[PDB]
Amino acid sequence: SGPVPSRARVYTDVNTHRPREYWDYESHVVEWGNQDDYQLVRKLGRGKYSEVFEAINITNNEKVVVKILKPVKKKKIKREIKILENLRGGPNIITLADIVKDPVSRTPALVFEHVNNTDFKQLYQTLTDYDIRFYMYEILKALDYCHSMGIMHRDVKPHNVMIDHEHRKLRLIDWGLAEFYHPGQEYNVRVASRYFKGPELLVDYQMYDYSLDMWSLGCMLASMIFRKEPFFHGHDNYDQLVRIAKVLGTEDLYDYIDKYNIELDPRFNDILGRHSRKRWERFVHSENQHLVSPEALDFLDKLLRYDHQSRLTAREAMEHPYFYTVVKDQARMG
Template sequence: MADSLPESGPSNPDNYEIVRKIGHGRYSDVFEGVNVQTALRCAIKSLKTTRDHHVRREIKVLEALRGGVNIITLLDIVTGDQDRPTSLVFELVDYVDFRSLFPRFNAADVRFYTRELLKALEFAHDRGIMHRDVRPHNVLFDPVKRRLLLIDWGSADFYEPRTEYTVRVGRGWKAPELLLHHGEYDYGVDMWQVGAMLAGCVFRREPFFHGVSNADQLDRIARVLGTSGLRNYVERHDMEMADVDDIAVHAGRPWTEFVDDENRHLAEEEAIDLMDKLLRWDHKVGFTLELEDGVVGCLLTMMSLGSVEREAGIGPSLLPRRRFIVGTSLLTNEFYESGVLVLFLT
């Protein structure tokens, strides 16, 4: 596997041969290929889009993420006329489709893959990058090598405070701020999507929130989190109330109501606790990922609101900060130290 792009610069298409098609998306097709000079097997992402600035942004993101833990490696850039990128070449990974894999997950698998996904996002967030489209289709699972890779950084962008963003991502994993067309979002969109994936794995319902439109998606989330929290969120951030006027009034449901005989072995108290902290209406009340040297895993910092405070509309600035250490398992050891709640994923 190459650690950097070829010193000679972008490659000619003749350097690669196509073996077979292995995937497709709105803006690209993906093929298994081989480098005819090195015989290296690779994945070739053939770009459909003519939006040069989007392609160049994706390349810039991938170059910034080079060497990142659990992040797909960009090996080469193939150019065409006027040196426009036509294909991106990546390492080839033998993976199992998530839809066939997740029904076989046990609790240890859920813990492991959640931790590995958070590691990838910690690396990206530490470099100012939001993925914005974290969902099963964009995560490769290799159960044989016990490996996870976060792929498809085409929707990613560099975070700038007080910037209006737009992005089109899979509805089933869209964070509330995206459903409400709130442009000034941040890394919280990624953390919501991790929570949605975790809920799908634990309760064996993928996607967990499955609406047929943005309005229906909001309604399905409100059935679980409650409508009053949604209205408080919209008012707090001065969003358009028209987006929620048609949402029915729901009291919300505790996560334990989704536990049944089929998923009970996955619905560990600690997993549900983490899920609850990730799936919050307010993108300002959730996890951020920061690297802490000397700690195995990631440092997750959150502003924790209890149910009473959430319903009262108390903002995070009025509440104490809690820190969560992600190690190797879902919140199995838990203790307080100087008012800081520390939880290890061991």
């Protein structure tokens, strides 16, 4: 038997039409700068794969951000570098400015354009209904671009969205989990953060595509309009699917498994149970109702689907009525 193959609905063959060196990052040669051009000012945050510092470029007194990479496979470093270089200059994509190594420790580090140390997670508590739509639209610009360039981000979450609210600009960061989409390729399902993992990751379906990012975006949107962080609050990867099933229902879940002939881990048998598909009104209350509208719920429903092929693409999402006012305002002034 085996699982049923799958293909992305959009941007399916974009990498095939590219020269090999565009996506064959294992053969990419890295252009190393001089780390003596940069002095670290202060630590910004600590991660599982890197440490982020505010720094200064000695040569031109320019503020930068330096991401010191924790030891990982050489090919993973080349992948993040190649993806950042391919996407450089794209809408709302963080700009990679330089690549350096410590002379003694040989530890690699990436230097980025400076952004204010404010991510989406810290800000959305004070956001109006319009601001949520505005910044969701800006994220969709970055996703539609990188998807059109044949790249899945695979780690979309509020922590990876830096926002300068005073200037109303945002940047999508942390491309260390991003990967090139190739039709027929099977990918590692051990990606993204638990609360944002798509059902394809949780049931171990490896032939996924750009639509993985659209599930993660739906998880972000639900947490913001409902003020429930996270929206799917699982204890682990198994319970994460249970939390989803208690909302989206078990019937569509098993139909999804049947459609792609997915061999489900037997542990799920005794924990998924039977659950109806819940109406989104269940999560509306007096403190979030000003963020919830029929347009928001209709848009959210079309993102959070078990069947990855049934989710809105980034471009389809940008044309939803949820963004009509945002589109009109950008047409007038931008």
